[PDB]
Design a protein around this ligand. Structure first.
Ligand code: NA
Ligand SMILES: [Zn+2]
Ligand SMILES: [Zn+2]
Lengths: 637, 619
C-alpha cells in the first residue's frame, strides 16, 4: 500500500467491499459525478498543486480586488489534503454504519452522499473532529489553558492575560472543530477582570475607558487578522439582555466569591460599551468578526429588557451589524437528557449548545424524484431523514472514539460537551422544492407559496420534526433541524441535480431562507413565513431583509422590530450595502468621507453575517464554474 | 485520467516514474519505506495508525492534519525539484539527485516543504514597528502605538512567519524595538510609574508564555532571542532612527538594561514553570583576549550560573553586521537579517564507506556530491523565486524575508564517524580523538567544501554557507540508511553533530580544540556543548572558562546542567521540587542547543545517544 515498471500509483487500504461499492457507483453515475463531489482529479496531488500555484495571475486578470483576496502558501497545506481526508471520512463512516446497521444501509448512505441526495457538512473533517460549540469561558477563567498540555498555564490574574487566554482559546478551538467558536458570555467574564484591575490600581482610573477599548482593539483585530489562510476563525459574540444574564448565571460566582448576578448592570454597561466601540471602529476599518447577535426576551408584545432592546435598536441604525435573536422564554437557558437550547450556525446559539455534525437533506432532489406526488414526496423524505439519523449516529460514535483516543482535549477539559451537542438534520432548497412541485406562484404581493404550497412546507418540516423526536429514543441523543447557510451546498446540490435530472431542475442555486433572498416579494410575506416556520426548526434559521436606505428614525426601526418579533420571527437582521475604499474605511455611497477615495468593494449579509462581496464571489466562482483541465509548456510534459 | 481512478494517480512525467521504478528495483521497498515514500502515502493506514496510536502503546487532532499530507508534499517537492534540475542541468543530474536523496547520500532538509516555502530568517522588527502587519492583506492594521499592541503584533508575526517557513523565526533586535514602546507608554502616562517593572514583566510574561503555548501540534514555533552586546547595538543601528525620530544609538544603555531585565526575569520564571522558547543567545564581541563589552559578558556569565540557559556567541569582528556575509546557524545566533532558504546535507560517513579507505577517492566523491548539492540548492532557489512571483510568499514582498540575505546551505554531518570509518580516530590516555592525519583529513574535507561554497557564488549568482547541522532526526535516518546499504561496515547507530560526538568520552580540551580549529571553517555554523555534572562554584571560575573557550576560537557554545521538573512543571535541581514537594519526573536538556524535555527527544536520541553523553566532573 501507499506508493507503488513505471506507472506509479498510490494505493489506499480499503476493504474490498468498499472498493467494489465505489467502482460500481462510478460505473452507474459516471466520472463527472465523482468529479462534482470532489473525488475525481482533486486527489491528484501534482495537478492540484500546479493548479493552485498558478491561480494568482488568473485572479489578477479577472478580479479588481485580487490584491486583497490573494492566497498565500499557508492555504496550500490546508487545501491539499481535503479531498483525501474526505475520502477517508466517507470510508470510515461507511465502516461504522456497516458495523451498526449493516452493509445495505452503509452503501445507501455513500451513494446518497456522492450523488447529492444528502450533503455531509465539513466532509473533509467528518470522521476526525466535530462541528461547533458556543462556549462558556468559565473553565478558561478558572483553569487557564489546561487543554495545552506541554506547559502548565496559571489562570489569568489580570485583564491583559485574560484577553490573551481568550485569543489563544479561540485559535485552539478553531483547530479542534470545523465550525463556529461562540463566546456568548465573554463580557460576563471580561467585566470581572476590568473591575479587579481597577480595584488593584493596575488600570489607572483616569485611563479606565482607554484600557477597556485598547483590549477591545487587541481582541477584535486579533480575531480578524488571519495567521493561516485569508479567513479568520468564525467567532460569535452575544449581547445577553438582563433576562438572559439573570437566568443563565443564577447562583453562579466569580473567582472572588461574588455572585455574578450582583454585577448585571456592570455587565450590561460593558456590553453596551463594546457595541458602541465596534460601531465607531468600522469607519476606521471594516471587519467581519465577531459576528454580533443580541439575545432578547420578548413576550406578549413587549421586550422584558426594553432598555437593552432600545439600545440595540439605536446602535444598529449605523451599520445594522447586529442580528436580532428573539425568544419568548428563558427556561431553556435557566442556569445552564433531551437537549433544549437554540442551535444556529450563523449566530445566537445558546451558551453551552452546539452540534457535532450537520447532514443536510436535498429537498429539491426529492421533488424531482416525486414527480409532483406529495404523498410520494413525504415517503421519500421520511426514509431519507431516517438514513441521515443513522449517519449522524455513526459520526457521533466516531467522535466518541476520537475522544477516547485522546485526540479531542476540548471534551476532556469540559469546554466542549458531547451531551450538549445536537446531531443536525439540515434542510436546503425549501423554495425550489416547492417550485418544482408546482406549489409556488406570483400574485399582487409578489412571489409566494400557494395555499397548498404552505401546507406542503408545514408537512415537510413536521415530518422531519417527528423523525427528530423519534431519533432521541432511537439513538440516545438529541436531533435538531437547521435551514443551513449552505454557502457551497446550495450550489453543488443544484449542480448534481441538474446532472441527474437535466432541465427538470431549472435553478442555478438553492435557497437558504424560506423565501429566496432575491425573490421579488412583499416583506410581509417573508415575515409571515418566518413566523410560521422558525418555530418548527426551533430558531434554526435566519430572515434578513435588505434595506435600500437606513431607517430614518429609531422609532420607525423599533416599530418594525416589534412587529417582526410579534409575528414569531426568531432570528433576523436588516441588510444595508456597506461601501469600503482601498484603505478599508466603511461608509455609504461612492466616496469615502475619511480619505475621499472611491468605493472598491461592498460588505453585505449574504448568508447571515457581513462579508466582502468580492470574497463571496471568489469563493462562488471556485465551485460554480469548475475549470476544465488545461495544460501549459510544463504540464503538457 | 488522474486522481481517484480503486487507485490514486498523480500526474508524473513518465521519465520520473521510470526513474522511481528503477530505484525501487535497485534498492528495494525497504529503501522507500525508510525514506518516507512507502506505505506512509496510504492515507487510510496512516490515519488508522495515527488515531489508534494512543490506544495500542505503553498529541491531538490538530497534529493529524499537519502530518497526513507530509509524505505527499515531500513526493511533490522531490518531483518538482527533479523537474527544475532537469530543466537547468539535464536529466542525468536530476536523476542523480533523486537517487542520492532517496538512498541517503544527501539529506534534503524540510523535505515535505522544499518546493513550497523556504527554511529560515532572523528578522528585524523594524517593518512591523513601521508598517504593522502588511503581509495580511484582508485587513489594514495600523502600526502599534503602545507596548501592548506591539507585543500582540510580534506574537502574530511569529505565528504568521512560522507558517511561511520551515525553520526558526529569529528576533535578534526584539529589545531594541520593545524599548521604544516602554519609553513611549511611560511618557504618556499609560503606566503607573510605580508599576513600571511589573508592567514590563507582564508583557514579558504574555509574550514568553504565548511562544510556549502551541495552538496547533505539541510544539511551539522555533523562536530565537539575542542579547546584543553594546558593540553589536552600535554597529547594527548606526544612523538608524525610532518612529519619533530619535537615534537608536542614543538609547544603547536603555536597551541593554531592558535586555538584562528580560534575562533576569526569565531566570526567575523557570522556577514557576519551565519553558523552551525563545532560545536564548548572547552575542559578544571578543578580541585579543578580552570582551569589548565586559559588563555584558560578566552579566551573561552571572545570570547563566543558575540554569546555563543562554548560548554564548563569540565573534572577533562586527564588520559583517555593520556576496553575503553574516552568521547563519540553525540553532541560534544567526545575525540580524540573515537566513538560509534551504539546507541540503552531505552524508560524510556514506563517502567513507564508498571510498574504501582511499582518501583521494573520498575527496573526489565529496567534491562531486557537494557540486550536486549546489545544483539542487540552485534549483530550490528558482522554485522559491517562482513561489514569490506567484504571490504565495508575502514575507518577501513586504521586505521581512530578503532572498538576497539568504544563503543556500551545504550541510555536513557525521564528520567523526566518517573519519572513524577511514581509520583516522583513536583512543589515548585522554580519551577518543582524531589522529594527527585525522585532523588533516577534517581540514581537507572542510577546505574542500569551503572551496566549492566559494566557487558557488560565481557559478550560481548567490552565496553558499556551510553548517554542521543539528540533524535531530537526520543523524539517525542517515545512519540507518547506511546500515541498510553497507551492513556491519557501518557500526554506528547515530551520526555526530559536533566535531567530536557528545557521546564520545574525551578530555574537554579536545572538544574545545576541535571547535577552535574548525568553527571558523564553517563561519560559526556549529555548536559545542560542555556538559557539566554540577553548576560552576564561582562566577570567576565560570568566567575564566568562558574566556579560555573564546580564546581558543570557539564561536558558539553552551554549558549544560540537567534541569529537573516535577509533574507541575517547576524547574529545579535534585529529586524533590522545592516548590510543591513533588518528585522529579523529567529532565530538561539541550537536545542540540535548545532546552527541551528529555522525554520529548526522538526515540533513538532518547534511548541510544542521550544516556551516553559525556558529563564532566571537573574542568
Ligand atoms: Na462547514
Ligand atoms: Zn477611505
Ligand atoms: Zn513542583
Amino acid at each position: 500500500s501507499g506508493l507503488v515498471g513505471s506507472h506509479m500509483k498510490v494505493q489506499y487500504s480499503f476493504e474490498r467491499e468498499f472498493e467494489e461499492l465505489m467502482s460500481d457507483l462510478l460505473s452507474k453515475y459516471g466520472y463527472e459525478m465523482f468529479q462534482m463531489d470532489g473525488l475525481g482529479d482533486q486527489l491528484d496531488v501534482v495537478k492540484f498543486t500546479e493548479d493552485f500555484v498558478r491561480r494568482g495571475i488568473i485572479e489578477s486578470t479577472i478580479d479588481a480586488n485580487a490584491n486583497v483576496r490573494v492566497t498565500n502558501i499557508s492555504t496550500y497545506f490546508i487545501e491539499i489534503s481535503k479531498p483525501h481526508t474526505y475520502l477517508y471520512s466517507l470510508y470510515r463512516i461507511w465502516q461504522k454504519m456497516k458495523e451498526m446497521f449493516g452493509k445495505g444501509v452503509a452503501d445507501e448512505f455513500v451513494e446518497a452522499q456522492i450523488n447529492g441526495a444528502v450533503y455531509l457538512h465539513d466532509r473533509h473533517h467528518a470522521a476526525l473532529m466535530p462541528y461547533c460549540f458556543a462556549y462558556t469561558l468559565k473553565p478558561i477563567v478558572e483553569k487557564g489553558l489546561p487543554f495545552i498540555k506541554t506547559i502548565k498555564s496559571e489562570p489569568a490574574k489580570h485583564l491583559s492575560t485574560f484577553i490573551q487566554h481568550v485569543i489563544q482559546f479561540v485559535m485552539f478551538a478553531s483547530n479542534q472543530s470545523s465550525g463556529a467558536v461562540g463566546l456568548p458570555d465573554f463580557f460576563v467574564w471580561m467585566w470581572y477582570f476590568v473591575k479587579k484591575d481597577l480595584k488593584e490600581g493596575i488600570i489607572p482610573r483616569d485611563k479606565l475607558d482607554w484600557y477597556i477599548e485598547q483590549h477591545f482593539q487587541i481582541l477584535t483585530y486579533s480575531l480578524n487578522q488571519p495567521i493561516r489562510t485569508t479567513q479568520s476563525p468564525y467567532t460569535n459574540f452575544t449581547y445577553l439582555d438582563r433576562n438572559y444574564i439573570k437566568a443563565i448565571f443564577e447562583g453562579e460566582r466569580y473567582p472572588d466569591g461574588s455572585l455574578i448576578t450582583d454585577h448585571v448592570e456592570d455587565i450590561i454597561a460593558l456590553q453596551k460599551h463594546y457595541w458602541e466601540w465596534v460601531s465607531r471602529e468600522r469607519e476606521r476599518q471594516m471587519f467581519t468578526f465577531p459576528v454580533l447577535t443580541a439575545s432578547l426576551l420578548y413576550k406578549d408584545g413587549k421586550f422584558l429588557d426594553e432598555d437593552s432592546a432600545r439600545f440595540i435598536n439605536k446602535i444598529n441604525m449605523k451599520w445594522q451589524d447586529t442580528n436580532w435573536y428573539i425568544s419568548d422564554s428563558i427556561d431553556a437557558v435557566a442556569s445552564c437528557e433531551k437537549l433544549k437550547g437554540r442551535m444556529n450556525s450563523i449566530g445566537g446559539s445558546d451558551l453551552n449548545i452546539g452540534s457535532f455534525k450537520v447532514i443536510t437533506v436535498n429537498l429539491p432532489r426529492i421533488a424531482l424524484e416525486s414527480g409532483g406526488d406529495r404523498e410520494k414526496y413525504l415517503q421519500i423524505l421520511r426514509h431519507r431523514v431516517q438514513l441521515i439519523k443513522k449517519a449522524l449516529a455513526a459520526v457521533r460514535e466516531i467522535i466518541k472514539e476520537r475522544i477516547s483516543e485522546g485526540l479531542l482535549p476540548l471534551y476532556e477539559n469540559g469546554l466542549m460537551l458531547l451531551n450538549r451537542q445536537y446531531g443536525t438534520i439540515g434542510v436546503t432548497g425549501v423554495w425550489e422544492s416547492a417550485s418544482i412541485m408546482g406549489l409556488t406562484t406570483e400574485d399582487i404581493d409578489g412571489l409566494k407559496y400557494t395555499e397548498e404550497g404552505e401546507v406542503f412546507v408545514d408537512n415537510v418540516l413536521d415530518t422531519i420534526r417527528e423523525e427528530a423526536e423519534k431519533g432521541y429514543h432511537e439513538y440516545g441523543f438529541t436531533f435538531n433541524i437547521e435551514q443551513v447557510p449552505a454557502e457551497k451546498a446550495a450550489v453543488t446540490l443544484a449542480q448534481k441535480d441538474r446532472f441527474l435530472f437535466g432541465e427538470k431542475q431549472p435553478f442555478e442555486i438553492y435557497s437558504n431562507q424560506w423565501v429566496p433572498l432575491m425573490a421579488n416579494t412583499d416583506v410581509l410575506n417573508r415575515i409571515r413565513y418566518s413566523g410560521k416556520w422558525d418555530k418548527k426548526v426551533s430558531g434554526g434559521a435566519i430572515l434578513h431583509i435588505n434595506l435600500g436606505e437606513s431607517f430614518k428614525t429609531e422609532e420607525e426601526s423599533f416599530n418594525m422590530v416589534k412587529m417582526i418579533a410579534d409575528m414569531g420571527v426568531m432570528y433576523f437582521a436588516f441588510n444595508t450595502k456597506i461601501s469600503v475604499c482601498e484603505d478599508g474605511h466603511a461608509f455609504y455611497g461612492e466616496r469615502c468621507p475619511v480619505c475621499g477615495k472611491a468605493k472598491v468593494d461592498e460588505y453585505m449579509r449574504i448568508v447571515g453575517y457581513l462579508v466582502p462581496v468580492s470574497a463571496f464571489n471568489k469563493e462562488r466562482r471556485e465551485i460554480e464554474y469548475p475549470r476544465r483541465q488545461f495544460y501549459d509548456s510544463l504540464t503538457i510534459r
